[PDB]
Amino acid sequence: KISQYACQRRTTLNNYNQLFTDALDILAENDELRENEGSCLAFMRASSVLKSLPFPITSMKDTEGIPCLGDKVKSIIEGIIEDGESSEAKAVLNDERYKSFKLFTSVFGVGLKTAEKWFRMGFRTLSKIQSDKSLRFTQMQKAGFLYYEDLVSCVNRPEAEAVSMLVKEAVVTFLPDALVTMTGGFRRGKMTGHDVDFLITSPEATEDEEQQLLHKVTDFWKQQGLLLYCDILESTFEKFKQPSRKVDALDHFQKCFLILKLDHGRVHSEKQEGKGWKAIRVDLVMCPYDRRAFALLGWTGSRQFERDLRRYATHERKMMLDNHALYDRTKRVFLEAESEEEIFAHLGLDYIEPWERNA
Ligand SMILES: Nc1ncnc2c1ncn2[C@@H]1O[C@H](COP(=O)(O)CP(=O)(O)OP(=O)(O)O)[C@@H](O)[C@H]1O
Ligand SMILES: [Mg+2]
Ligand SMILES: [Mg+2]
Ligand code: NA
């Protein structure tokens, strides 16, 4: 019996139901844009459970016993079985507001509010936005437009590995005992990503050394001429605060959102061609050593896997989980973990491998 929780399912990248889930992902994204949080959640949970199936749906009988498939979702599945297409998802793909939101938020530094503002101003293309003489752009958006073609092309595994080498070389220069781990999509086995994410931790660094590392590493890259964009968010981490009760838990660790200049010579791929370098989005997170397993688990994702992990912890175990800690409300104790496996064992869950968290 398939669990309603993604954290009790193994979801690998061999999706046999992409015809259904691509349509459900589009419908979920449109509900996010139309501020319909409820309908968005229902389509996300349905899409997530179909991604876990070891076989393709070929008839309505195949949906029997599958949880998170409401009447609205089953009508969409029925229509795709009928014609090979979703008329509902097709209408969203042709919707002017949806097309504009997807196009505008494809720019680094552009969120829902700015995308909505530009749409209501009558903008429909990035060319008309960039060349406008009255518009004022944030420093984030300026970088988003300047490095647009590189950022919109997918980061591949040779590029992610080349970035990992750069991160490790910079980090060990200031903290030689530091542990650097690639997280996000690439840790889940993806071939491509929009960015490359890393978790950095040090067993012997002080509170001040931990705070200064991201400033030292980015100043080093600025000196090398590799820092194209940099935004460092200081830590708001509280060692003894209870974990978040929120559906989407906020991360309080020190972090930075970067754009790095990746020279072609550093990339060992099958394939100089153009300018000789590529702009790469990189996120770095620094966490205290004792919280490394919670941070790794939170930053590995997927977003749906994290949501269900926290929901399961609260509703089934009366535990509070976030990226910083695990608290047991019955025992009235914080639970320690040196690995992700120990977190899963505390929660009474079978261990799910990172490549099985693609919910
Ligand atoms: N502010 C934040 N707080 C908590 N977790 C976060 C976070 N930002 C990102 N994450 C987590 O870190 C993982 C990597 O984040 P992202 O880079 O935003 C998406 P991804 O799953 O890696 O695919 P992608 O980078 O190709 O789009 C996510 O799967 C999510 O669980
Ligand atoms: Mg990522
Ligand atoms: Mg990221
Ligand atoms: Na954006």
Question: Residues 210, 289: contact at Cβ < 8 Å?
Answer: no
Phi, psi of 283 (to 5 degrees): -115, 130
> Tell me, what CATH number does 340's domain have?
3.30.210.10
Question: How many distinct structural domains can be found in the chain?
Answer: 4
Question: Which listed ligand is nearest to 194 at the C-alpha?
Answer: 1
Evaluate: CB of 194 within 6 angstroms of ligand 1: yes
Q: What is the distance between the alpha carbons of residues 253 and 289, in angstroms, rounded to a whole number?
A: 12
Element (H, E) at 133: none
Q: Nearest-CA neighbor of 313 among 302, 298, 296, 291?
A: 298
**Cβ–Cβ contacts within 10 Å for residue 259, how many?**
24
Whose CA is closest to atom 19 on ligand 1?
Answer: 184
Tokens of 62: 């195949």
Identify whether residues 256 and 314 lie together within a single domain: no
> Tell me, what CATH number does 230's domain have?
3.30.460.10
Cα–Cα distances (Å) from 74 to 20, 31, 55, 144, 222, in that order, read 10, 17, 17, 39, 53
CA 278 to chain centre: 21
Q: Would you give the DSSP letter of residue 330?
A: T
Identify whether residues 214 and 236 lie together within a single domain: yes
Q: Ligand 1 centre and the CA of 300: distance in Å?
A: 7
Resolution (A): 2.2
Q: Ligand 3 centre and the CA of 196: distance in Å?
A: 6
Of 68, 94, 120, the last residue of a domain is: 94
Any binding-site annotation on 190? yes
Of 136, 153, 170, the last residue of a domain is: 153
Q: Nearest-CA neighbor of 98 among 107, 90, 109, 110?
A: 90
Tokens of 18: 């992409």
> Tell me, what CATH number does 5's domain have?
1.10.150.110
The answer to whether residue 283 is catalytic is yes
List the catalytic residue out of 22, 95, 231, 283: 283
Identify whether residues 172 and 206 lie together within a single domain: yes
The answer to whether residue 195 is catalytic is yes
Domain containing 79: what range?
Answer: 1-94
Q: Ligand 4 centre and the CA of 58: distance in Å?
A: 36
List the catalytic residue out of 31, 150, 197, 308: 197
Who contacts 265 (Cβ-Cβ below 8 Å, separation ≥6)?
A: 272, 276
Terminus-to-terminus CA distance in the chain, angstroms?
A: 17
Identify whether residues 181 and 100 lie together within a single domain: no
List the catalytic residue out of 31, 150, 195, 322: 195
Of 94, 119, 141, the last residue of a domain is: 94
Identify whether residues 5 and 77 lie together within a single domain: yes
> Tell me, what CATH number does 140's domain have?
1.10.150.20
Question: Residues 328, 314: contact at Cβ < 8 Å?
Answer: no
Who contacts 3 (Cβ-Cβ below 8 Å, separation ≥6)?
A: 9, 67
Cross-strand pairs, 151 = none
Burial of 305 (0-12, 13-18, 19+ CB in 10 A): buried
